[PDB]
Design a protein around this ligand. Sequence first.
Ligand SMILES: [Mg+2]
Ligand SMILES: [Mg+2]
Ligand SMILES: [Mg+2]
Ligand SMILES: [Mg+2]
Ligand SMILES: [Mg+2]
Ligand SMILES: [Mg+2]
Ligand SMILES: [Mg+2]
Ligand SMILES: [Mg+2]
Ligand SMILES: [Mg+2]
Ligand SMILES: [Mg+2]
Ligand SMILES: [Mg+2]
Ligand SMILES: [Mg+2]
Ligand SMILES: [Mg+2]
Ligand SMILES: [Mg+2]
Ligand SMILES: [Mg+2]
Ligand SMILES: [Mg+2]
Ligand SMILES: [Mg+2]
Lengths: 55, 68, 96, 100, 114
Amino acid sequence: GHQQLYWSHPRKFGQGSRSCRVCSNRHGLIRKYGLNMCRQCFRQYAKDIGFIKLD
Amino acid sequence: KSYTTPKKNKHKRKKVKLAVLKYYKVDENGKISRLRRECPSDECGAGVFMASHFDRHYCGKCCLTYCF
Amino acid sequence: MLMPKKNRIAIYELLFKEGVMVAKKDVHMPKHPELADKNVPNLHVMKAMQSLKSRGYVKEQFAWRHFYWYLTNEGIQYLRDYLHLPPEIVPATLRR
Amino acid sequence: HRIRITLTSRNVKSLEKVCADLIRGAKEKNLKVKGPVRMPTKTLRITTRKTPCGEGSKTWDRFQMRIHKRLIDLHSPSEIVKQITSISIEPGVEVEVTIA
Amino acid sequence: MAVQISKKRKFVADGIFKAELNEFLTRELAEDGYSGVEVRVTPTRTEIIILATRTQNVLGEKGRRIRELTAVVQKRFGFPEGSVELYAEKVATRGLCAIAQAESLRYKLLGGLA
RNA sequence: CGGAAGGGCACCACCAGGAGUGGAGCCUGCGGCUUAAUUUGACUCAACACGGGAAACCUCACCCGGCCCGGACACGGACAGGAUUGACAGAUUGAUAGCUCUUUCUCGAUUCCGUGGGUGGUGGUGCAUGGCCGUUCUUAGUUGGUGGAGCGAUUUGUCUGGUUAAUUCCGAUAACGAACGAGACUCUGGCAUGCUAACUAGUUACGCGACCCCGGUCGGCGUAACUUCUUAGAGGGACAAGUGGCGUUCAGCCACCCGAGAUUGAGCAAUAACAGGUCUGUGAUGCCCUUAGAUGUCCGGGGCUGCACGCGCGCUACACUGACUGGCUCAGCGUGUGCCUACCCUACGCCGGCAGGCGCGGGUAACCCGUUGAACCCCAUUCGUGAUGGGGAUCGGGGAUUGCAAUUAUUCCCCAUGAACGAGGAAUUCCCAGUAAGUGCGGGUCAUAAGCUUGCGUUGAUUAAGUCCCUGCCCUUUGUACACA
Ligand SMILES: [Mg+2]
Ligand SMILES: [Mg+2]
Ligand SMILES: [Mg+2]
Ligand SMILES: [Mg+2]
Ligand SMILES: [Mg+2]
Ligand SMILES: [Mg+2]
Ligand SMILES: [Mg+2]
Ligand SMILES: [Mg+2]
Ligand SMILES: [Mg+2]
Ligand SMILES: [Mg+2]
Ligand SMILES: [Mg+2]
Ligand SMILES: [Mg+2]
Ligand SMILES: [Mg+2]
Ligand SMILES: [Mg+2]
Ligand SMILES: [Mg+2]
Ligand SMILES: [Mg+2]
Ligand SMILES: [Mg+2]
């Protein structure tokens, strides 16, 4: 049926399973320290998180 | 844009006027006559009738098949 | 949206027992994360609250993946007329 | 008797003020106190591209996040530690009180 | 805590918490004069002060929108009942706040001033 | 702007050199060609190991098919004598897609049929835009208020001369008072036998234990003061301060004594602009296109890897200053069990040659991996100038891990096959002190995974303390028939 083909592909791995938590896109994801967000929004919200370019 | 192969039609639902009339058989006395088989499943206890096909019986929403 | 009537009444009862309701933008969700007792899929929650939004009953806000609906007074009156509830009881966001 | 306060903070001088205030509180409440033991700090380093797209010169950011962790051992019962940690806390410092 | 998360992930999660908080209240309290947030995380209580200009407009009809924001934070971040509480505070000398003058200027351009 | 002059500066310039690339193999990207599709953006610096783009599914935007509505809301029908959801069967299909045919059961006003209208779009347009980045432009430049000159566009201030990495200062002066930038600032590196600290770092003394002939070793155990080694806080320290010269004896320059430093390195970075890149980062977005037989969304397979060709970034090497085989012996950045999330670092004991497998433990981290027993290097054999024991491309047979799925070999291991390459033409890149180069280790991409990139550590030099010769840049003067210059 349609219920057995709509969301039956395995999403246990890969970059298509995870996404950004702002853009929900699947490119340039920062998975380090559980950020799980793209580098553009990381540059956007690094001041709000606490990251700062000291050196 | 124009296509070569014609499209596949949508399933036109076969409407049936008074399908409950084909279930029971009325009598002039005080009784009822049940033609089709009742399903013994837990979701459909005693009231739900089954489908009477040309070869063997089947109940739909609980998906239970009785072959001959 | 051919929704189940029990799930529709459960989502409207949750929306009445707390006026603002949240959701996550993900169609491929088995159950709602806040109300996990019933089935109540997230796509049904999104489309039911979008049907409330389109006819001017609820207020929309969004934070990156999450929908937020502020229930207005016309939505209070509509959910009261739908659920046939007495006008004495109020939601908890009006309670203090 | 031996109760361990762990102070984790991002800012430096605020954490120094908090640990010095805990030292002054232990000195006023007259208990055997150990010195503020510093841990080696952690520098969370992220290196991304400056350009949102990919077309430009190869420039790279260095986003740093320094976190610091001090610890103070106290020889006192639980109510004294709760009375000390309840008073004068500021948002930069996270406090973890271990009984054992 | 039973999940036992590391401090490396914990401070990052607090930073993303503050970032999503700031973005959500920037989107929601834009017409009312939003200027920032300040969250004090105490044991068993979470004080979270909205710093804004028009306190009467952020409180609304007998504190209704403040209670709505408490329920938003509770339902979204999974906080226990009565574990988080918001407080709206007025900005002194609000002309120096840059985002308040920015929202004032964009609402002037939306209203139709030159 | 000048193949015009007067000064200064830059290893994205030169000189003296160092390692190279271009010569061979392989990897990656682009163009071309082929193809159902080989998705696309970018083409000097400022495109081409770039989109963090190491794509078997997803990503995926391309092609071939098959599903679904996730077309809200309003207005009309239609219907409870049922508006209409789902369905194992036999056919069809790819699939156990009721997708359609044959066939009847089921859900119960949620829905379906039309008209307006939205919604969704990695669709088009960055020559409509926002934001961000790069570039002009790593150089030292730029701008008001008032006063003065000129009818005016404009000019002075913003400079004759000296000095500086600097429009940095001294000094002149129709200018005065100022402002951004530079500088100042922050972090990093080193010096403090002094202050604070320490059972998540130790020190040295003791008490034992083990071994060798009173003494020596122990990261074997435990405790006694202390912080030298450990880590991180407040301080301090270096300022052309002292001396000898040059210099209007001002601004400043060189050398030397004391000394851990007598230019450590990065971040930030002005006015004005490019019709530079991005709509394929966004639920940032205008307009246009589509919107049910979909450019929306889901699934299966393929492709993004295709190969007569050329270019670019890199890896492997061309060996004897080397290769192989054993022995010795030393690191620092770091990271590590996740909201969804299904995937962690691994000690130790057995099985197997190996890739690996089986069980008990430790670790949310100065606790455990871990004293991080890393390579280069050192020592001792084998080799003998032979395309050789250099080099490992290509290819056959087998064995393991990850995953639903490896075929166009995902990777790893074993045996075997053993190509060009004998130091590379014109051309050209990067660099001067713990620097280049050799060399290995962590993070990102990661389920499986480093020829890339970003950080760190080991060994560690040649040559230079200058110049405008080339390439360019910044001031002043000059000329212009240029001003998309
Ligand atoms: Mg057309
Ligand atoms: Mg030079
Ligand atoms: Mg060059
Ligand atoms: Mg040369
Ligand atoms: Mg070559
Ligand atoms: Mg791959
Ligand atoms: Mg694919
Ligand atoms: Mg889009
Ligand atoms: Mg442009
Ligand atoms: Mg253009
Ligand atoms: Mg596909
Ligand atoms: Mg490619
Ligand atoms: Mg070539
Ligand atoms: Mg060999
Ligand atoms: Mg050979
Ligand atoms: Mg790459
Ligand atoms: Mg002339």
